[PDB]
Design a protein around this ligand. Sequence first.
Ligand SMILES: Nc1ncnc2c1ncn2[C@@H]1O[C@H](COP(=O)(O)OP(=O)(O)O)[C@@H](O)[C@H]1O
Ligand SMILES: Nc1ncnc2c1ncn2[C@@H]1O[C@H](COP(=O)(O)OP(=O)(O)O)[C@@H](O)[C@H]1O
Ligand SMILES: CC(C)(CO)[C@@H](O)C(=O)NCCC(=O)O
Ligand SMILES: CC(C)(CO)[C@@H](O)C(=O)NCCC(=O)O
Lengths: 302, 304
Amino acid sequence: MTPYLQFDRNQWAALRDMLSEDEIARLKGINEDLSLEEVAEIYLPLSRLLNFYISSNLRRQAVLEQFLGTNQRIPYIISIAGSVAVGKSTTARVLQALLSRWPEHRRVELITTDGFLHPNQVLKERGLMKKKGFPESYDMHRLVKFVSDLKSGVPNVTAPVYSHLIYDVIPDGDKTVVPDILILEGLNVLQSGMDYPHDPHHVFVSDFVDFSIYVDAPEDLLQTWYINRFLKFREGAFTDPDSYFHNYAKLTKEEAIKTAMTLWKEINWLNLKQNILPTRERASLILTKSANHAVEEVRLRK
Amino acid sequence: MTPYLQFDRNQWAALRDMTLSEDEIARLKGINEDLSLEEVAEIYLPLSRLLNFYISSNLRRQAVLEQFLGTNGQRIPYIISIAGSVAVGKSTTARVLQALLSRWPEHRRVELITTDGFLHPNQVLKERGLMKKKGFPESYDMHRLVKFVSDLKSGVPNVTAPVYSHLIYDVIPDGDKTVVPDILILEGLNVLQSGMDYPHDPHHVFVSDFVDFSIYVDAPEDLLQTWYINRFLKFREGAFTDPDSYFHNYAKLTKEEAIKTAMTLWKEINWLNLKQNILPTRERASLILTKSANHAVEEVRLRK
Ligand SMILES: Nc1ncnc2c1ncn2[C@@H]1O[C@H](COP(=O)(O)OP(=O)(O)O)[C@@H](O)[C@H]1O
Ligand SMILES: Nc1ncnc2c1ncn2[C@@H]1O[C@H](COP(=O)(O)OP(=O)(O)O)[C@@H](O)[C@H]1O
Ligand SMILES: CC(C)(CO)[C@@H](O)C(=O)NCCC(=O)O
Ligand SMILES: CC(C)(CO)[C@@H](O)C(=O)NCCC(=O)O
């Protein structure tokens, strides 16, 4: 047996017994390629599950508040891990939208770990410009302190912001979080001190996370999704010489595809095998994706 | 602000509204003759109440989820771990909590397992030249400890754990203990450690990943040394007429030199272990129980 309850697509979709015109438009605005049937059969039930954990947490809090005689609101935190291009950003944003359906979750914030990467200046200095996503490219102590402060009750917490448009951290663009729920999305949210032997931390991100989800998918599908996303970014930079991807418009489509393929195999895939995939069993829930991003399996810790 | 709610002794003791039976009082004395009954009433009863709230909350949610997921799965044991320095009082704390948690009709089975049993036998330790490193990461068969709590959290009906004997100073060759429980208390100095502590043989899912609530018993080095030495002395005294005891070896030394010997085991082995491997894991605990003179609890910190 394993520490996980398992559900194939049908079993998971069977969990349903809930979307409005505004809500359907918002989901399409999130990702035009997002299937409404996928949302209805997979993500709605997932948001319900999450709400049960959150509700349970809120009720516990009230019972303990009475017993302990205390006076403070602390954000419930959900992290989302997985390979680059597996769909963390889409999953996070979909969950942010759905969790907003409950009157209790008036404020659902979303922060990605991309922002906590060391700026390109610093990475170049360390010779890590070809290692974005790897442990050493992150200012981990800062990421840990971010969730630590939130879990300490600090009213306003600030997070750095990254721009895939300029391919670097935005100098003066730090975002200020003022939330009932915080969704932390990043390939490294399940990593820990062992992943940073060069600069170890002893309290991990997971130590300040209530529920963690690992989005999973085969290497062959991840490669395809990565490349197709790359191509979209390239196309979108054809008339924007200020865009980082405008550098790929000079290449023929064919050489651009090979370039993307090389970025995937030598950087992102290597990162997946050495640092990301090994953290999968630390997740509260594993979301296994299949062709066309269809979820085929859901595993939840017993 | 910190990730912890804080309570000094008085504020904590103020959490109590409970009366202990004559049999319950007899059991506590039996657990440890020096355990203050007042201490139990003002510190440990409230702590057992707190734990019960977390456990209850877990059981209720399990019901809500069973209904939703339609998975009338196996009952999974709620696991509580207790960490801290050698001689801080983990064993006493665990046994006291085991007794108190038994008061609720819901917690019929409250098992207690110590990680000492998961140490590599002396033979293995000697061949690896680690006989002077008991308690350090490399002296543990960590993969086995991880699998133990992993199996419990997988719903495995009966799980077996190796057992250690402080009297023979080694793993008991054929004394494995079989756990068949609503609650499992896992006591050990290394329950909060992780992969980073075992670079020589890394694991990627930690003990804490299978623990519901963790407690770190904390105390100053000066008090820990005193408690360690006094426990050592009682161990030596108990071995005076037992040539089949590990501590008989110390009966040959004058009390004075026996104390210095004990003091040396403390400083060069246990204290070093505390500084390099145990103390750093403290902030990973759900609750920090800080003891002071005579083992009196002076502070309690609980994760917000
Ligand atoms: N559920 C989904 N349905 C359809 N396309 C998806 C889905 N999730 C992700 N994608 C697409 O696949 C790619 C990877 O998702 P993205 O969120 O950018 O990855 P990540 O944040 O994990 O790096 C994007 O091109 C995105 O539009
Ligand atoms: N609450 C307590 N009150 C009085 N004495 C205690 C208490 N807890 C522990 N002790 C004593 O202090 C010593 C250390 O406790 P012990 O449980 O053996 O340590 P550990 O399991 O952490 O190695 C023992 O000699 C024990 O009798
Ligand atoms: C910032 C990450 C790691 C995650 O979002 C990714 O966008 C990235 O830049 N990876 C490095 C190799 C690449 O895809 O260019
Ligand atoms: C078994 C441990 C590691 C913890 O219970 C400790 O009691 C031990 O025997 N080793 C430290 C050296 C000593 O006190 O003899």
